[PDB]
Amino acid sequence: ISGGSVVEMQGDEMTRIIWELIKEKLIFPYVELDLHSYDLGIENRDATNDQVTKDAAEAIKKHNVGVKCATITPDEKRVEEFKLKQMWKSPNGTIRNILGGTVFREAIICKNIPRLVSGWVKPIIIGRHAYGDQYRATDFVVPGPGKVEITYTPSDGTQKVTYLVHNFEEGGGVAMGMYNQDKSIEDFAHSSFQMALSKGWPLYLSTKNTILKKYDGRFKDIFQEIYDKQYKSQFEAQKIWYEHRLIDDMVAQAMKSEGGFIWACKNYDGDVQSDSVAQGYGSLGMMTSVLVCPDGKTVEAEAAHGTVTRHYRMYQKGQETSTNPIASIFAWTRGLAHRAKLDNNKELAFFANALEEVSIETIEAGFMTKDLAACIKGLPNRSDYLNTFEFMDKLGENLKIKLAQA
Amino acid sequence: KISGGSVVEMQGDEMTRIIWELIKEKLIFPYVELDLHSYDLGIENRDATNDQVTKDAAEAIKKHNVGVKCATITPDEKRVEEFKLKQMWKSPNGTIRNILGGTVFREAIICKNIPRLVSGWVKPIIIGRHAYGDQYRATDFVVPGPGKVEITYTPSDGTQKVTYLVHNFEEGGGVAMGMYNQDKSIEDFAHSSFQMALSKGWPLYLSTKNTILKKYDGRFKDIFQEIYDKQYKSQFEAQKIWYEHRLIDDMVAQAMKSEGGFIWACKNYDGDVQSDSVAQGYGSLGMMTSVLVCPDGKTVEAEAAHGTVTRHYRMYQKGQETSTNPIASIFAWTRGLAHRAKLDNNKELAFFANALEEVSIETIEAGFMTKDLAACIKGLPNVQRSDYLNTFEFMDKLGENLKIKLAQA
Numbered sequence: 001i002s003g004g005s006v007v008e009m010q011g012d013e014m015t016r017i018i019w020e021l022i023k024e025k026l027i028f029p030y031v032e033l034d035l036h037s038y039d040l041g042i043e044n045r046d047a048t049n050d051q052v053t054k055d056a057a058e059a060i061k062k063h064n065v066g067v068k069c070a071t072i073t074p075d076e077k078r079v080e081e082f083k084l085k086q087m088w089k090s091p092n093g094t095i096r097n098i099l100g101g102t103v104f105r106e107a108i109i110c111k112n113i114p115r116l117v118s119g120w121v122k123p124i125i126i127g128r129h130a131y132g133d134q135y136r137a138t139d140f141v142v143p144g145p146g147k148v149e150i151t152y153t154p155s156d157g158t159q160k161v162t163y164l165v166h167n168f169e170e171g172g173g174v175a176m177g178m179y180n181q182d183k184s185i186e187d188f189a190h191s192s193f194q195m196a197l198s199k200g201w202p203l204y205l206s207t208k209n210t211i212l213k214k215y216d217g218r219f220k221d222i223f224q225e226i227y228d229k230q231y232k233s234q235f236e237a238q239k240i241w242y243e244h245r246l247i248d249d250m251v252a253q254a255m256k257s258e259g260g261f262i263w264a265c266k267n268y269d270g271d272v273q274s275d276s277v278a279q280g281y282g283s284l285g286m287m288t289s290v291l292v293c294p295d296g297k298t299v300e301a302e303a304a305h306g307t308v309t310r311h312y313r314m315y316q317k318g319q320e321t322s323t324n325p326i327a328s329i330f331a332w333t334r335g336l337a338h339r340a341k342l343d344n345n346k347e348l349a350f351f352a353n354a355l356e357e358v359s360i361e362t363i364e365a366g367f368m369t370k371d372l373a374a375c376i377k378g379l380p381n382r383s384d385y386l387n388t389f390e391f392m393d394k395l396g397e398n399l400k401i402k403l404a405q406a
Numbered sequence: 407k408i409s410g411g412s413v414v415e416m417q418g419d420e421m422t423r424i425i426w427e428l429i430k431e432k433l434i435f436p437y438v439e440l441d442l443h444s445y446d447l448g449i450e451n452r453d454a455t456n457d458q459v460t461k462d463a464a465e466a467i468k469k470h471n472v473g474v475k476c477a478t479i480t481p482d483e484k485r486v487e488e489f490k491l492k493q494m495w496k497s498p499n500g501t502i503r504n505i506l507g508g509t510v511f512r513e514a515i516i517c518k519n520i521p522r523l524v525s526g527w528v529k530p531i532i533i534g535r536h537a538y539g540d541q542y543r544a545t546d547f548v549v550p551g552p553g554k555v556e557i558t559y560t561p562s563d564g565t566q567k568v569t570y571l572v573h574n575f576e577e578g579g580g581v582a583m584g585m586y587n588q589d590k591s592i593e594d595f596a597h598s599s600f601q602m603a604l605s606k607g608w609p610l611y612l613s614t615k616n617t618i619l620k621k622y623d624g625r626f627k628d629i630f631q632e633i634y635d636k637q638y639k640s641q642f643e644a645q646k647i648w649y650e651h652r653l654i655d656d657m658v659a660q661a662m663k664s665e666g667g668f669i670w671a672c673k674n675y676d677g678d679v680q681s682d683s684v685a686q687g688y689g690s691l692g693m694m695t696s697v698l699v700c701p702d703g704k705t706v707e708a709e710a711a712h713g714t715v716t717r718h719y720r721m722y723q724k725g726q727e728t729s730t731n732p733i734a735s736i737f738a739w740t741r742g743l744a745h746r747a748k749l750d751n752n753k754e755l756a757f758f759a760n761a762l763e764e765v766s767i768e769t770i771e772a773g774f775m776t777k778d779l780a781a782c783i784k785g786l787p788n789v790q791r792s793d794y795l796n797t798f799e800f801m802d803k804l805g806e807n808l809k810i811k812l813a814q815a
């Protein structure tokens with residue numbers, strides 16, 4: 001299959017290893033691609049002073065489809081490990097801040113994988129605003145007594161306003177400024193309403209506008225305006241609704257619901273609650289994560305659950321590993337699925353969906369990695385699972401079998 | 407009657423205000439005479455006093471050491487129109503908490519017969535919510551158009567002014583905000599967290615996002631680790647427990663799959679969010695205690711961790727039957743009275759407070775409960791009217807069982 005142009009972002013440690021096997025055994029044997037590869041490995045980002053992160057983001061803007069491997073965001077320990085020049089910032093934040101949009105996250109559900117939350121019989125889709133707030137903030141330590149202020153200087157000559165954040169009288173502490181943008185919020189709202197109409201489900205927006213009356217009130221107002229002016233009639237035609245809820249009420253409503261709704265989250269809440277939801281369905285790694293940009297055509301699919309450092313340690317030590325590749329697989333299929341839509345590549349669309357089916361049916365047939373065997377029988381309880389290479393070998397077979405019968 | 411002593415009462419709003427009176431009339435006043443210092447924190451009285459009554463109540467809590475608070479309305483624009491308010495008043499919980507300081511400890515109220523929504527939580531989860539700063543003392547504003555937003559720090563000793571660019575709005579407007587926290591408050595927060603873990607014999611976890619907020623959240627992580635290494639590590643090892651810092655998103659996942667049995671120190675915002683998640687995970691927002699424990703070790707503010715339950719209130723004012731779980735509000739009283747008794751060595755009052763808590767749990771375990779807990783047993787689509795009691799019917803049964811239990815003692 002002539003898949004077309006796709007931007008690839010290589011990753012780190014075990015996810016890097018799986019990334020290549022995904023390419024060699026599941027994608028390349030059936031799809032020919034005009035790949036634009038950017039190596040976002042921790043060592044290459046350091047070598048390029050993180051410019052490669054900036055380059056890849058622009059390439060996605062240029063070619064409209066990116067697929068990203070899990071990467072390391074370095075901490076103190078990692079700076080020493082790789083002797084890094086700086087503690088480089090999260091490349092996910094960099095890419096999202098450049099492209100903007102909404103990261104849609106949803107569990108990857110298998111019949112035989114137990115949930116931790118009893119009632120979630122329908123999926124929950126979180127729309128995480130991908131821009132601003134804590135992820136582009138300016139925080140600093142306050143070393144001692146002093147005055148912390150935040151000021152806004154209008155460009156049209158209107159008066160500068162100054163607000164007291166806090167007067168530190170006896171000691172120091174911490175302070176920080178953050179922001180968000182009307183246009184970004186408007187895109188976030190449009191993406192949320194359109195996702196609800198596509199799935200035929202109600203939409204909920206969570207904020208804390210009772211406490212952040214101006215900051216979070218802006219989110220509430222923009223959503224309600226766009227709803228009243230542009231979507232209410234469409235929602236009523238489909239027998240769905242939109243509601244704003246305070247964040248603490250919303251997570252409780254989600255916990256007790258049956259699923260089957262779209263959940264628009266501010267950036268920070270989307271990060272936190274998407275991991276809570278993913279784990280609630282059975283496994284934190286069984287999740288899709290696709291950034292949908294405002295233009296409606298540009299997309300970045302990713303594996304969101306970081307690397308598997310302990311698996312990498314054994315892999316290079318020669319010890320057998322059993323690492324779950326599903327999320328990395330679904331970053332590809334979701335990217336290829338979008339590639340097909342942009343190009344009307346019906347052949348690629350079938351392949352993308354076929355591979356997702358093969359992954360689910362393979363696991364639902366009892367062939368799975370150690371991660372899922374523990375979910376079923378509990379970690380304390382080799383014959384129950386397949387090692388990394390053995391599992392991917394099986395997916396290759398069922399994919400070739402499934403594709404042949406066509 | 408039992409001589410209860412001095413207690414600061416804060417009256418509330420909507421459904422919790424209605425329940426608040428039933429608790430006093432049916433469960434407290436018939437058995438306890440109190441020197442109550444009542445402050446009406448109803449939205450309309452706060453507006454009339456320009457929110458001064460909220461500040462007065464906070465200082466009264468400092469004076470009498472025991473406060474019990476009904477849920478209140480924090481108004482937004484819609485609430486200003488509803489009540490024709492002078493201003494969009496700030497959360498009185500934030501005002502009280504910022505004045506007194508300390509840690510809000512929240513935990514589910516567990517009944518044998520109530521199924522959970524989270525499978526593994528066989529041990530309790532206790533959240534220690536930092537009660538000071540962050541979003542609850544922030545300075546936010548709308549950015550009407552293009553312009554430059556900066557945040558600056560001016561030392562009081564005349565040293566260099568430090569200026570940071572927050573963002574330059576080039577096309578259109580948006581929102582901006584400043585936030586802060588204080589070393590001493592974090593230090594108190596850490597001490598209260600380590601001491602709670604040692605008291606319960608459980609490990610402690612602190613959740614932050616220091617990978618993104620390297621300075622802001624890193625300060626929390628560093629202060630906790632310093633105080634731990636210098637003052638608590640040895641005690642933790644003696645009891646076979648531990649302390650570790652975790653990323654917030656990692657932590658909520660860890661908690662979801664855990665079996666419980668740990669202390670969870672949360673920044674102010676995270677404590678609010680996750681306390682509702684945890685309470686619902688164990689079964690119901692109404693089955694949770696919430697007590698602000700101040701640094702002095704003597705002052706206390708007991709509350710119900712949930713809101714004023716507006717949606718239930720709308721039906722009540724329509725004259726319709728409602729079924730709102732009052733246990734959390736009841737336990738705000740018992741927890742406050744229990745602390746009042748401890749400070750006063752009031753063995754009779756201490757017995758009463760504990761007796762009512764036992765009656766609350768025993769009544770539910772005997773099959774008498776509100777609709778929320780009935781749904782926990784039989785999926786909400788399957789609940790029938792015969793499976794639960796309305797709010798007043800439930801309180802009547804607690805009154806009867808309380809009368810019985812107190813007689814037999």
Ligand SMILES: [Mg+2]
Nearest residue numbers: 271272275655
């Ligand atoms: Mg995350």
Ligand SMILES: [Mg+2]
Nearest residue numbers: 248678682711
């Ligand atoms: Mg709350």
